[PDB]
Design an enzyme around this catalytic site. Structure first.
Site, PDB file in Angstrom:
ATOM      1  N   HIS A  67     -14.163 151.686  24.967  1.00 58.84           N
ATOM      2  CA  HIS A  67     -12.927 151.510  25.775  1.00 58.84           C
ATOM      3  C   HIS A  67     -13.155 150.651  27.028  1.00 58.84           C
ATOM      4  O   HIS A  67     -12.898 151.106  28.134  1.00 58.84           O
ATOM      5  CB  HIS A  67     -12.350 152.870  26.117  1.00 58.84           C
ATOM      6  CG  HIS A  67     -11.751 153.562  24.936  1.00 58.84           C
ATOM      7  ND1 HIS A  67     -12.362 154.612  24.319  1.00 58.84           N
ATOM      8  CD2 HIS A  67     -10.573 153.382  24.290  1.00 58.84           C
ATOM      9  CE1 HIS A  67     -11.574 155.077  23.361  1.00 58.84           C
ATOM     10  NE2 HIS A  67     -10.464 154.339  23.319  1.00 58.84           N
ATOM     11  N   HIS A 105      -3.741 148.533  28.505  1.00 57.31           N
ATOM     12  CA  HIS A 105      -3.373 149.809  27.839  1.00 57.31           C
ATOM     13  C   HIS A 105      -4.463 150.884  27.993  1.00 57.31           C
ATOM     14  O   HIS A 105      -4.175 152.075  27.706  1.00 57.31           O
ATOM     15  CB  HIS A 105      -2.973 149.566  26.382  1.00 57.31           C
ATOM     16  CG  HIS A 105      -4.149 149.496  25.476  1.00 57.31           C
ATOM     17  ND1 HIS A 105      -4.933 148.392  25.432  1.00 57.31           N
ATOM     18  CD2 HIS A 105      -4.690 150.387  24.630  1.00 57.31           C
ATOM     19  CE1 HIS A 105      -5.920 148.600  24.547  1.00 57.31           C
ATOM     20  NE2 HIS A 105      -5.802 149.834  24.050  1.00 57.31           N
ATOM     21  N   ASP A 216      -4.078 148.487  18.578  1.00 57.71           N
ATOM     22  CA  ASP A 216      -5.108 149.394  19.118  1.00 57.71           C
ATOM     23  C   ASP A 216      -6.168 149.697  18.058  1.00 57.71           C
ATOM     24  O   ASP A 216      -7.335 149.856  18.442  1.00 57.71           O
ATOM     25  CB  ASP A 216      -4.489 150.691  19.572  1.00 57.71           C
ATOM     26  CG  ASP A 216      -5.336 151.364  20.619  1.00 57.71           C
ATOM     27  OD1 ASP A 216      -6.259 150.688  21.179  1.00 57.71           O
ATOM     28  OD2 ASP A 216      -5.055 152.544  20.859  1.00 57.71           O
TER      29      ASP A 216
HETATM   30  C1  LIG Z   1     -11.993 152.979  13.655  1.00 54.34           C
HETATM   31  N1  LIG Z   1     -11.250 153.695  14.629  1.00 54.34           N
HETATM   32  N2  LIG Z   1     -10.451 153.051  15.427  1.00 54.34           N
HETATM   33  C2  LIG Z   1     -10.045 153.897  16.359  1.00 54.34           C
HETATM   34  C3  LIG Z   1     -10.516 155.180  16.055  1.00 54.34           C
HETATM   35  C4  LIG Z   1     -10.128 156.341  16.808  1.00 54.34           C
HETATM   36  O1  LIG Z   1     -10.084 157.446  16.277  1.00 54.34           O
HETATM   37  N3  LIG Z   1      -9.772 156.179  18.133  1.00 54.34           N
HETATM   38  C5  LIG Z   1      -9.440 157.260  19.045  1.00 54.34           C
HETATM   39  C6  LIG Z   1     -10.085 156.520  20.204  1.00 54.34           C
HETATM   40  C7  LIG Z   1     -10.431 155.379  19.177  1.00 54.34           C
HETATM   41  C8  LIG Z   1     -11.356 155.012  14.946  1.00 54.34           C
HETATM   42  C9  LIG Z   1     -12.273 155.930  14.245  1.00 54.34           C
HETATM   43  O2  LIG Z   1     -13.272 155.559  13.629  1.00 54.34           O
HETATM   44  N4  LIG Z   1     -11.956 157.225  14.329  1.00 54.34           N
HETATM   45  C10 LIG Z   1     -12.778 158.200  13.747  1.00 54.34           C
HETATM   46  C11 LIG Z   1     -12.471 158.667  12.336  1.00 54.34           C
HETATM   47  C12 LIG Z   1     -13.202 159.864  11.898  1.00 54.34           C
HETATM   48  N5  LIG Z   1     -14.572 160.030  11.852  1.00 54.34           N
HETATM   49  C13 LIG Z   1     -14.669 161.353  11.420  1.00 54.34           C
HETATM   50  C14 LIG Z   1     -15.878 162.074  11.226  1.00 54.34           C
HETATM   51  C15 LIG Z   1     -17.087 161.470  11.489  1.00 54.34           C
HETATM   52  C16 LIG Z   1     -18.245 162.198  11.316  1.00 54.34           C
HETATM   53  C17 LIG Z   1     -18.189 163.526  10.894  1.00 54.34           C
HETATM   54  C18 LIG Z   1     -16.973 164.112  10.640  1.00 54.34           C
HETATM   55  C19 LIG Z   1     -15.779 163.409  10.819  1.00 54.34           C
HETATM   56  N6  LIG Z   1     -13.492 161.960  11.217  1.00 54.34           N
HETATM   57  N7  LIG Z   1     -12.557 161.046  11.498  1.00 54.34           N
HETATM   58  C20 LIG Z   1     -11.151 161.287  11.391  1.00 54.34           C
HETATM   59 MG   LIG Z   2      -6.194 154.534  24.810  1.00 55.35          MG
HETATM   60 ZN   LIG Z   3      -7.149 151.339  23.125  1.00 52.77          ZN
END
Ligand SMILES: CN1NCC(C(=O)N2CCC2)=C1C(=O)NCCc1nc(-c2ccccc2)nn1C
Ligand SMILES: [Mg+2]
Ligand SMILES: [Zn+2]
EC number: 3.1.4.17
Length: 312
Positions: A67, A105, A216
């Site tokens: 961020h 943002h 985003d």
């Molecule tokens: C690519 N991206 N852009 C934005 C963004 C996001 O969330 N933003 C909030 C602030 C940025 C992601 C992202 O990768 N989010 C994680 C997705 C995820 N990893 C895991 C997980 C991993 C390991 C063990 C267990 C679960 N669960 N989940 C649902």
């Molecule tokens: Mg934000």
């Molecule tokens: Zn953002």
């Protein structure tokens, strides 16, 4: 009569949705001005005021893994690409407001979620009970706009000024992913029952909100090595938050627990299926020329499926 011009490879590739702004931090301000000049006009902002606003905005992003100032410019570029591919759909004030909203943002982000601020009992959680960081980011935008020589909107009437600041407030609040699920369901029902109306202000608000989510989350719409290396920065933040949750005596969710690194690929599939793909699908229905974002997201889902199959 003073344009910004970019080298040839950047001049061509900046027009594409998957453009990566590169590792030369000092070129990012110029890239942003370039995008304002082409998406808004060389008359939108007084160059000296715009330059001074951009540099104070940079100063108010922190040195966190994800961020950070690079994320702000990256999200602005995705918005540039959407605006340039949908020339006639947006008002003059929307073109002005939205690139600025994207640059601002995540102002003064600390690398922690709204959840962590609430469990830590941070002062910002008492001032803003929901969308805690996003109300702070809007508050930081208004501060910087009110510094001497930083009012880039000084030529707007009092009512236009109020309208642009309302576009920015709503666009920034919409980057709270907790708000995205409901916004997208309403947009899905509206488009399918054919009630969607771009002269209805509350409908425009929802569509601009979805655009903010799309911009985003745009690391998922990049070439695979960009997507994969950006994910490392995302988890570096999440895992630091997980460590801080353990310090407060709370088991974090697995997404934020570095002991559960092994589960990232399955977590990526959930995220693509539950958040990213539905985001770019609805956006493509409303704004057909944004289809390249959906196609790139689907290519990256298929790369995470290869990771799970041990093909990389
Ligand atoms: C690519 N991206 N852009 C934005 C963004 C996001 O969330 N933003 C909030 C602030 C940025 C992601 C992202 O990768 N989010 C994680 C997705 C995820 N990893 C895991 C997980 C991993 C390991 C063990 C267990 C679960 N669960 N989940 C649902
Ligand atoms: Mg934000
Ligand atoms: Zn953002």
């Amino acid at each position: 009569l003073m344009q910004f011009t970019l080298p040839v490879r950047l001049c061509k590739e900046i027009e594409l949705f998957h453009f990566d702004i590169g590792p030369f931090e000092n070129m990012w301000p110029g890239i942003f001005v370039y995008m304002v000049h082409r998406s808004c006009g060389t008359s939108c902002f007084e160059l000296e005021k715009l330059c001074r606003f951009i540099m104070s905005v940079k100063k108010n992003y922190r040195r966190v893994p994800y961020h950070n100032w690079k994320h702000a410019v990256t999200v602005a570029h995705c918005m540039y690409a959407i605006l340039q591919n949908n020339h006639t759909l947006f008002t003059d004030l929307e073109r002005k407001g939205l690139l600025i909203a994207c640059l601002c943002h995540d102002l003064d982000h600390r690398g922690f979620s709204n959840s962590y601020l609430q469990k830590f009992d941070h002062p910002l959680a008492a001032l803003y009970s929901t969308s805690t960081m996003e109300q702070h980011h809007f508050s930081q935008t208004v501060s910087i706009l009110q510094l001497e020589g930083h009012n880039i909107f000084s030529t707007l009437s009092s009512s236009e000024y109020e309208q642009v600041l309302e576009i920015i407030r709503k666009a920034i609040i919409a980057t709270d992913l907790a708000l995205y699920f409901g916004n997208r369901k309403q947009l899905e029902e509206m488009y399918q029952t054919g009630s969607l109306n771009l002269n209805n202000q509350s409908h425009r608000d929802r569509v601009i909100g979805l655009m903010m989510t799309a911009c985003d989350l745009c690391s998922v719409t990049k070439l695979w090595p960009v997507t994969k290396l950006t994910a490392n920065d995302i988890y570096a933040e999440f895992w630091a938050e997980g460590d801080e949750m353990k310090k407060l005596g709370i088991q974090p969710i697995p997404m934020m627990d570095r002991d559960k690194k092994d589960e990232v690929p399955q977590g990526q599939l959930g995220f693509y299926n539950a958040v990213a793909i539905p985001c770019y699908t609805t956006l493509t229905q409303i704004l057909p020329p944004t289809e390249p974002l959906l196609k790139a997201c689907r290519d990256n889902l298929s790369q995470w499926e290869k990771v799970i199959r041990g093909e990389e």
